[PDB]
């Protein structure tokens, strides 16, 4: 019976392995029955620190035999009675909850798993790329399992991970040229190793009942991007002409709405300055200057501009993830959501897989380069999706954020580092998410694109994320 593969990361270090443990466990045809089995249990209970619900479960899996061993925990010298210890073999995950979403866990073979497929002492991926590759991995009940290994930095991965310190958020980090993700962090998190070997009902219900839902793939759900998208709806305007970038628009006050047939609806912006240019309007995240350039270029423009991108596609990463869109229609049908869309708010809906890759158009002249997480794939590339005038204006000026001493990132400025950044924020029906885009462009070897959700409680992604783009700055370079 096959040893399961491993899977790596980028340079062969552990994401999911196996290690063998000496476990405390029981044999249930020595544990005897009724209220004295139920002593037993109690006894083992008290003395190593497992609920006694935890203990009935696993006695109770499909696989567990008269004189099975079961492994409860891991390892004495008075053994109640039914007790035994042994060496087993147990999937492991080094980087832990760090990487809980995007690795998964396995588990012990159902009937129902049996019902559509396997030994019933085997292990099959529940969740995650565990179960994404199980086929590959679980090898042949002989032949071993294949070694997966992924784009994926485990020292990346690790500090992207604790930046949040349980803060709602996500973060992808990816080579921009290559398509490599070299972390894929959803945050909060749960631990794997305890999914996959013996957790308490307690501890289980503790997750789920967390309004936060850790088991949730951040980085793989649709999103609103929120005013970073600016950056897409300038380059957009820029190519259709209508956009001028040394045009400087007279813009007063901190709210604006084209006509009264808006209502009590207007675009914001949080800082007063005028007249305004395209540069000024990134460095300042000017909302209004972006709703007035939406409605120059006209509907037509700009889905133009926005069907570039990869709005409606399915994509080869073995990550499940719902295709990004602009609208729940065909048509805006409503001046307000048109220009809502120009800043990053309406009915967009995109993960953070899917903006890295569309905002990786501002590190390649224009070229999108496809995510890839098997470190072996050839690499991807939707050509012109934007001019490389366009993408190289737009990456200049968002150095502004980071190198003006007001700009919303200078706490990261780097006199040795070239560091383009874009922070924005979405509002949803309320609490706001709050988002920071970086790119090197010292080497165009990183682009970073972090959210903090519920940014009115939980502070700003600019805020937690200078450690991460410290370590890059140093490690990728
Ligand atoms: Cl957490
Ligand atoms: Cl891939
Ligand atoms: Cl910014």
Redesign the pocket.
């Given at each position: 019976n096959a040893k399961r593969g491993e899977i790596v990361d980028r340079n062969g270090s552990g994401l999911a392995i196996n290690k063998v443990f000496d476990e405390v466990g029981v044999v249930p045809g020595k544990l005897g029955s009724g209220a004295e089995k139920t002593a037993n249990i109690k006894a083992f209970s008290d003395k190593f620190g497992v609920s006694v619900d935890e203990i009935n479960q696993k006695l109770s899996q499909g696989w567990v035999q008269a004189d099975s061993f079961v492994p409860i925990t891991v390892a004495v010298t008075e053994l109640p009675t039914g007790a035994a210890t042994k060496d087993t073999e147990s999937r492991y995950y080094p980087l832990g909850?760090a990487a809980a979403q995007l690795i998964g866990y396995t588990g012990t073979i159902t009937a129902e798993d049996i019902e559509k497929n396997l030994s019933s002492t085997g292990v099959i991926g529940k969740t995650g790329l565990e179960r994404a590759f199980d086929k590959e991995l679980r090898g042949q009940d002989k032949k071993d399992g294949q070694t997966i290994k992924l784009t994926i930095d485990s020292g990346v991965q690790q500090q992207a991970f604790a930046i949040?310190?349980?803060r709602p958020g996500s973060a992808v980090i990816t080579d921009p040229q290559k398509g490599d993700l070299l972390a894929t962090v959803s945050?909060?998190?749960?631990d794997p190793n305890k999914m996959a070997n013996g957790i308490s009902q307690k501890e289980y219900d503790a997750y789920n009942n967390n309004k936060d839902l850790?088991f949730t793939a951040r980085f793989a759900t649709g999103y609103a991007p929120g005013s970073t998208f600016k950056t897409i709806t300038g380059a957009i305007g820029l190519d259709a002409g209508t956009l001028k970038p040394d045009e400087e628009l007279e813009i007063n006050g901190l709210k604006w709405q084209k006509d009264k047939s808006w209502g009590g609806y207007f675009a914001t912006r949080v800082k007063e300055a005028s007249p305004v240019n395209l540069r000024t309007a990134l460095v300042n995240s000017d909302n209004i200057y972006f709703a007035q350039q939406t409605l120059r270029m006209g509907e037509d423009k700009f889905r133009a501009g926005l069907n570039k991108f990869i709005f409606g596609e399915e994509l080869d990463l073995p990550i499940a993830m719902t295709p990004a869109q602009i609208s729940n229609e065909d048509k805006f049908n409503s001046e307000i959501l048109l220009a809502d869309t120009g800043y990053g708010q309406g009915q967009l809906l995109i993960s953070p897989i899917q903006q890295a890759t569309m905002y990786s158009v501002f590190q390649n002249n224009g070229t999108l380069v496809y995510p890839k997480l098997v470190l072996d794939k050839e690499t991807k590339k939707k050509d012109n999706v934007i001019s490389a005038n366009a993408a190289n204006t737009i990456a200049t000026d968002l150095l502004g954020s980071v190198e003006d001493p007001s700009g919303y990132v200078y706490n990261m400025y780097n006199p040795n580092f070239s560091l383009a950044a874009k922070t924005g924020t979405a509002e949803i029906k309320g609490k706001e998410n709050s988002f920071l885009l970086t790119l090197d462009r010292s080497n165009n070897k990183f682009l970073t694109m972090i959210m903090v959700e519920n940014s009115g409680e939980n502070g700003s992604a600019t805020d937690i994320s200078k450690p991460l783009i410290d370590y890059l700055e140093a490690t990728i370079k």
């Open positions: 909850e949040f310190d349980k945050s909060p998190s749960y850790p």
